[PDB]
């Protein structure tokens, strides 16, 4: 009526457990080899005698007269890096200045080009991720920039995280303090005329916390031109003003120590040519600015909760509309589950008291190369850093229909959103508990 | 129809609870003794009269006319050390230099050999675990190295955690800062010509966060030869260059205070003979380098979520294909569960501001013995340390079939992946609640 028979052993009734597990010493040796914990074979047999493979011949038979089903809970555990190549978090296109030249007697010829910089897999934490990006902009300048004109003064594109506009005085037209108040509010990206960044093929966008208000329109390009209204205002010549006590004030600090120009639009304007995203969003025209088509969001280092799909092709019936095949990247799905990664949050009031000390701690100002320029400076570390953290996930799918004849060797397969094994799985295993559902 | 009878007590119906527990004062005295919380006996009787053993005679009878089953939830609690012998986290083979000699008139005879160093069980935290490893490399040099030639200058194999390549200038061919920027990015292992490490029999690999892209091929050996492309570049002679202001620059610091050689390949090259894994991975040939067959992963101190299997040989029916036996290491399994250990993550911006202070805090530079050599130095402590932490696990297995005659003494057994009691169990106990499933 509801048996469960196996080769030659006492028949069992009503229910039991078949175990899908990678570890088994025997099968690892033989079976999987060129496989990994995301696409492997395993014997469900569990009987000490019998050579695996020869096991493959045997079968667990759930009484034929009834349609069976089984509860499938699984234990999935990864250890995927915040920033890696497979997830698309190690690359990102941006347009920078390539050459600054003296041409055809009087012309200033500026040549800009798009280029894709890559990051060294792993390096978690958001802030640091920013830094690694800024550094990659530089590392490039080091291989092309300088040796083709282009000064530091005109480095296009830099990810910062502050509100260049806190000091700002509605009359002066300047950041009175003479310094862009060094506190971190949200990541944003700053651009110089003519350049900009593109994330079309990168989840890092999600790390900065900047998304399109219309996601499905593939094409994340944020040009200098887009950051309308909201160019970082200029600094008051704190020195002049004070010593001068008319009043100098109108004097908008044009350079800095080591004399770098703050590219001011004209000898008059209080504004600089440096455009900030964060500004355009909440300080620019809400109806036509950038706030119109992009959204200011919480960072999230994981870069985006993605899901993984399970499949047990040789043991569960194929769900409603999937068709059975043998193409690993199209197997039927039997369970979906978010990919095991969380955002742990911490507190480091030590940030920026630490950037200050961190710089001495790290024997180099590698990230802060321009410790004077109020722009190109090293963005403030925000209190509350986030870090992707891997965690085992004791998930639980529902009862799923089973085949009344379970093969000795079952194939287990965890796929990702785009349907492809996921290299970062360290442990995957599931427990199935069959039971009756109705009869034929 | 569905009774539940016991010796001479009122019959009970429909369900109840039998308790599997180690603690009981009586049985501990008699029964288990030479056993432990992972392989013990216990009386299910729970009746104050009756000498255990004499209890063993009695039996709980679930009505014969029906096939019963019972829900089995358990409470498991361990306290296993991050690094211990049983889990294979206290040993690890590496190949180091044994002797440096002056031979047959003009020959420089270098003799290398493999050797297995061990660690002192317990010592959690990842960073510190690294240190303990580096220290073991040394401790060996102290017993063989020096007293056979071999200087410190040529110590093969050292686990570090930084990106020897941040300063690097694409033209100079040197790390301009004159110092390998002291910040921690990911663990990696550095090697000198001729030596290397092997983890074939160790989970520490998983601690460093370096795995094979093809796990099942038993054999984790990472030779110097493998770390192709990606030898730690050399340091700019910061002193010369500056004082000299042609420009010295080309001058790649050959030694350091206390004069140790940075083994530079030749009087010309800017590269040193020191090869870094981390470099080869993201800085070397992606198609043939090491990134081809190894994967950069998140650390994880636990060394690898392993599972444990339960078994109640004398109380549950033997699951589908297991056969009943009396060999403790083959009992049928009735429930699987991950071994109770998590990775708690913390923030210590105090790292490297602390290594700096930690060294004065610890009255010795035991781990930093070579505070000058930019390589052999003490790796930076990474912000965000991890620590294996034991936690009670209130797990829940499903309803499992029961025998209609439950013996007075049941045997409980928790096994591990390889099937062997697990010494680190402090508390294990379960509650079973039988109930009808169908009739005969």
């Amino acid at each position: 009526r509801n048996s469960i028979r196996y080769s030659e052993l006492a028949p069992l009734f009503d229910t039991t457990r078949v175990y899908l597990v990678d570890n088994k010493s025997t099968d690892v040796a033989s079976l999987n080899y060129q496989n990994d914990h995301s696409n492997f074979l395993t014997t469900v047999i569990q009987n000490n005698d019998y050579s695996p493979g020869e096991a493959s011949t045997q079968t667990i038979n759930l009484d034929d007269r009834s349609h069976w089903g089984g509860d499938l809970k699984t234990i999935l555990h990864t250890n995927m890096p915040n920033v890696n190549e497979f997830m698309f978090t190690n690359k990102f296109k941006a347009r920078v200045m390539v050459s600054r030249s003296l041409t055809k007697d009087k012309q200033v010829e500026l040549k800009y080009e798009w280029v894709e910089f890559t990051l060294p897999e792993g390096n978690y934490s958001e802030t640091m991720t920013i830094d690694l990006m800024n550094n990659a902009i530089v590392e490039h300048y080091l291989k092309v920039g300088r040796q083709n004109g282009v000064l530091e003064s005109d480095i296009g594109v830099k990810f910062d995280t502050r509100n260049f506009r806190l000091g700002f005085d509605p009359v002066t037209g300047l950041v009175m303090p003479g310094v862009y108040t060094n506190e971190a509010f949200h990541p944003d990206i700053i651009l110089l005329p003519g350049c900009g960044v593109d994330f079309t093929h990168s989840r890092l966008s999600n790390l900065l916390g900047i998304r399109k208000r219309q996601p499905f329109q593939e094409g994340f390009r944020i040009t200098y031109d887009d950051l309308e209204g909201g160019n970082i205002p200029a600094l008051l010549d704190v020195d002049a003003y004070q010593a001068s006590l008319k009043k100098p004030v109108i004097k908008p600090l044009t350079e800095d120590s080591k004399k770098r120009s703050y590219n001011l639009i004209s000898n008059d304007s209080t504004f600089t040519q440096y455009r900030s995203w964060y500004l355009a969003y909440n300080y620019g025209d809400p109806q036509t600015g950038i706030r119109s088509w992009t959204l200011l969001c919480t960072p999230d280092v994981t870069c985006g909760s993605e899901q993984v799909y399970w499949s047990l092709p040789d043991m569960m019936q194929d769900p409603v509309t999937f068709r059975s095949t043998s193409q690993i990247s199209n197997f039927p799905v039997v369970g979906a589950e978010l990919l095991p990664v969380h955002s742990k949050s911490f507190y480091n009031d030590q940030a920026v008291y630490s950037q200050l000390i961190r710089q001495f701690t790290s024997l180099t100002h590698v990230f802060n190369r321009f410790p004077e320029n109020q722009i190109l400076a090293r963005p403030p570390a925000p209190t509350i850093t986030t870090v992707s953290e891997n965690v085992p996930a004791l998930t639980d799918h529902g009862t799923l229909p089973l085949r009344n004849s379970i093969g000795g060797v079952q194939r287990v397969t965890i796929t990702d959103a785009r349907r492809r094994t996921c290299p970062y799985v360290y442990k995957a295993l599931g427990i199935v508990s069959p039971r009756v559902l109705s009869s034929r | 129809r569905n009774s539940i009878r016991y010796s001479e007590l009122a019959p009970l119906f429909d369900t109840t609870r039998v308790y599997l527990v180690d603690n009981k004062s009586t049985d501990v005295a008699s029964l288990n003794y030479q056993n432990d919380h992972s392989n013990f006996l216990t009386t299910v009787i729970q009746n104050n009269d009756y000498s255990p053993g004499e209890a063993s005679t009695q039996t709980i009878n679930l009505d014969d006319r029906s096939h019963w089953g019972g829900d089995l939830k358990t409470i498991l609690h361990t306290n296993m050390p991050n690094v211990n012998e049983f889990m294979f986290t206290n040993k690890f083979k590496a190949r180091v230099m044994v002797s440096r000699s002056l031979t047959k008139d003009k020959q420089v005879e270098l003799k290398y050999e493999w050797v297995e160093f061990t660690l002192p069980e317990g010592n959690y935290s990842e960073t510190m675990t690294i240190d303990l490893m580096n220290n073991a490399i040394v401790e060996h040099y102290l017993k063989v190295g020096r007293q056979n030639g071999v200087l410190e200058s040529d110590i093969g194999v050292k686990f570090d955690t930084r990106n020897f390549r941040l300063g690097f200038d694409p033209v100079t061919g040197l790390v301009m800062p004159g110092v390998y920027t002291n910040e921690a990015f990911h663990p990696d292992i550095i090697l000198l010509p001729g030596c290397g490490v092997d983890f074939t029999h160790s989970r520490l690999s998983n601690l460093l966060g370096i795995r094979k892209r093809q796990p099942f091929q038993e054999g984790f050996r990472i030779t110097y030869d493998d770390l192709e492309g990606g030898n730690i570049p050399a340091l700019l002679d910061v002193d010369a260059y500056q004082a000299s202001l042609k420009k010295p620059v080309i001058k790649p610091l050959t030694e350091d205070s206390k004069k140790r050689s940075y083994n530079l390949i030749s009087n010309d090259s800017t590269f040193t003979q020191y090869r870094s894994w981390y470099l080869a991975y993201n800085y070397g040939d992606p198609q043939t380098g090491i990134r081809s067959w190894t994967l950069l992963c998140t650390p994880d101190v636990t060394c690898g979520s392993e599972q444990v299997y339960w078994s109640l040989p004398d109380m549950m029916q033997d699951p589908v294909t297991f056969r009943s036996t009396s060999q403790i290491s083959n009992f049928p399994v009735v429930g699987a569960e991950l071994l109770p250990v998590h990775s708690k993550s913390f923030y210590n911006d105090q790292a490297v501001y602390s290594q700096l202070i930690r060294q004065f805090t610890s009255l010795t530079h035991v781990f930093n013995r070579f505070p000058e050599n930019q390589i052999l130095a003490r790796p930076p402590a990474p912000t965000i340390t991890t620590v294996s932490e034991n936690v009670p696990a209130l797990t829940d297995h499903g309803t499992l079939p029961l025998r209609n005659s439950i013996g007075g003494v049941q045997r409980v057994t928790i096994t591990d992946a390889r099937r062997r009691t697990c010494p680190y169990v402090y508390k294990a106990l379960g509650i079973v609640s039988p109930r009808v499933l169908s009739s005969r």
């Binding site: 530089v138 300048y141 080091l142 300088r146 530091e152 080591k258 100002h365 190369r369 321009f370 410790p371 004077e372 | 200038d169 301009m176 800062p177 910061v238 500056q242 420009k247 620059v249």
Partner: peptide, 10 residues
């Protein structure tokens, strides 16, 4: 005429 792009002073 070479920019090391690094503030050696401080």
């Amino acid at each position: 005429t070479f920019n090391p792009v690094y503030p050696y002073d401080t």
